[PDB]
Amino acid sequence: QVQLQQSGAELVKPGASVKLSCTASGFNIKDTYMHWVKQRPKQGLEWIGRIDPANVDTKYDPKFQDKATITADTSSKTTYLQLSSLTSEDTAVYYCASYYGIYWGQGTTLTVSSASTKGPSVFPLAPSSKSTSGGTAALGCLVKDYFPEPVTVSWNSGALTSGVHTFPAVLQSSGLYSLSSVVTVPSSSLGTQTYICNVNHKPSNTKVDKKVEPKSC
Amino acid sequence: DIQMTQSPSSLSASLGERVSLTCRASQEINGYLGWLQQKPDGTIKRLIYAASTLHSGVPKRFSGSRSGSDYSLTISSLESEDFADYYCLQYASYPRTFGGGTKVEIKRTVAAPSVFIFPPSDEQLKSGTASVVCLLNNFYPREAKVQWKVDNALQSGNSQESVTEQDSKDSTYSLSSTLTLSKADYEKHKVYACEVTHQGLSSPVTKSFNRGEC
Numbered sequence: 001q002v003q004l005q006q007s008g009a010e011l012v013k014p015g016a017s018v019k020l021s022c023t024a025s026g027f028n029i030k031d032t033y034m035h036w037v038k039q040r041p042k043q044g045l046e047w048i049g050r051i052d053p054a055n056v057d058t059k060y061d062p063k064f065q066d067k068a069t070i071t072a073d074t075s076s077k078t079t080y081l082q083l084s085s086l087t088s089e090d091t092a093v094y095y096c097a098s099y100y101g102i103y104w105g106q107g108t109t110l111t112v113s114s115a116s117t118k119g120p121s122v123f124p125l126a127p128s129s130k131s132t133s134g135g136t137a138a139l140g141c142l143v144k145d146y147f148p149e150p151v152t153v154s155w156n157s158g159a160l161t162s163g164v165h166t167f168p169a170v171l172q173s174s175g176l177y178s179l180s181s182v183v184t185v186p187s188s189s190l191g192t193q194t195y196i197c198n199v200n201h202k203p204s205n206t207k208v209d210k211k212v213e214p215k216s217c
Numbered sequence: 218d219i220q221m222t223q224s225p226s227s228l229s230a231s232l233g234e235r236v237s238l239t240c241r242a243s244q245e246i247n248g249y250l251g252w253l254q255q256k257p258d259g260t261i262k263r264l265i266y267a268a269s270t271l272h273s274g275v276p277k278r279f280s281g282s283r284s285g286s287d288y289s290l291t292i293s294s295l296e297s298e299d300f301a302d303y304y305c306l307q308y309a310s311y312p313r314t315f316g317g318g319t320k321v322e323i324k325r326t327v328a329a330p331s332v333f334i335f336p337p338s339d340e341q342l343k344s345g346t347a348s349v350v351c352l353l354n355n356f357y358p359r360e361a362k363v364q365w366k367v368d369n370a371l372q373s374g375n376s377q378e379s380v381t382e383q384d385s386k387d388s389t390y391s392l393s394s395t396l397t398l399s400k401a402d403y404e405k406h407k408v409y410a411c412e413v414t415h416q417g418l419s420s421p422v423t424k425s426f427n428r429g430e431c
């Protein structure tokens with residue numbers, strides 16, 4: 001069907017520039033009228049500006065007048081969002097919308113940081129500090145110091161899905177990410193069932209499997 | 218620039234309940250107003266345009282109206298798929314402006330958290346850093362206070378919190394708190410505790426471990 005296709009994720013250093021794209025799959029010049037919206041992590045929607053190619057007109061919010069530049073290629077039914085002199089404040093998801101907001105794109109994530117791609121360190125969150133059983137036990141894996149996100153975590157190669165809670169990552173003061181994945185299991189299974197978290201970080205091509213054993217400490 | 222003030226910013230409601238969200242315009246916008254819905258996966262869809270006209274295929278349980286400078290979106294009876302984030306948008310003038318947004322979450326009975334504390338691993342101690350984690354499992358409402366205490370001395374500025382989205386099955390939340398210390402500072406103390414306060418607990422619960430590192 002008729003939709004809006006956006007370009008993939010971008011990772012740049014502060015000071016640089018990026019050019020994102022949004023193509024209208026199966027449309028025309030009258031439909032090359034597009035809006036561009038910004039959304040910072042866990043925040044609201046912000047209107048950046050819009051392009052009306054038929055009247056070679058472009059409008060921006062005063063706050064983005066120096067930051068953004070929207071252009072349009074009527075032949076390919078694609079509009080481009082150019083963002084310059086990037087800072088951490090520009091790390092967000094950018095969306096595109098058609099005339100009257102009828103169709104919306106899937107969004108493009110932009111991450112601005114001086115950090116380099118690094119794989120994670122996986123540490124076990126062992127069940128019990130010395131206490132022998134108790135009813136329902138909890139165990140997990142601490143996925144620390146990786147960049148950029150995301151990272152995928154599964155348990156027992158996908159066999160264990162019940163009771164699993166994988167938390168949203170946090171940005172540490174070092175500029176690196178961290179998160180933990182936990183699972184509640186029966187205390188009676190700790191000495192007989194094997195628990196292993198499978199961590200996969202595609203950006204760095206790091207695949208780590210960590211067995212979580214009840215070391216009782 | 219026309220400003221849109223959206224209220225409330227958060228709303229807890231039960232299935233089948235009638236709810237209303239409102240957006241006040243700082244200037245006359247003459248019926249030019251649209252309403253959008255954003256699902257937790259980031260998908261955005263237009264629900265209403267021209268203040269009261271529904272987008273093709275949108276459930277008739279959704280409706281829009283105007284009373285003075287206040288524009289409202291009403292859901293006559295809430296369904297499971299309706300628990301998402303909502304935003305109003307004006308297009309009477311340039312620049313186009315959005316309302317702050319409203320998050321609609323599922324209301325359920327009070328659930329106390331299950332608390333667990335995790336000591337750092339020997340593996341991490343080799344790198345010179347120690348992470349102590351406190352887990353709060355399956356609770357409701359979202360509000361919860363976590364306090365760290367080392368040798369019964371309250372900590373500050375050295376902890377990080379992370380909370381999950383509301384669970385599709387039981388409508389509960391889960392939270393983790395991570396205390397980060399240097400191996401040196403960690404090895405100069407004995408008791409590490411996690412004090413939890415929540416509406417479903419009569420008195421604060423405390424979990425601790427003494428000397429643990431494996």
Ligand SMILES: O=C(O)CCCCP(=O)([O-])Oc1ccc([N+](=O)[O-])cc1
Pocket residue numbers: 050098099100101102250251252253263265266267306308
């Ligand atoms: O003169 C008219 O009929 C209004 C033209 C405004 C077209 P526009 O695309 O710039 O503004 C809009 C953007 C989004 C929506 N929406 O309901 O999401 C509605 C209008």
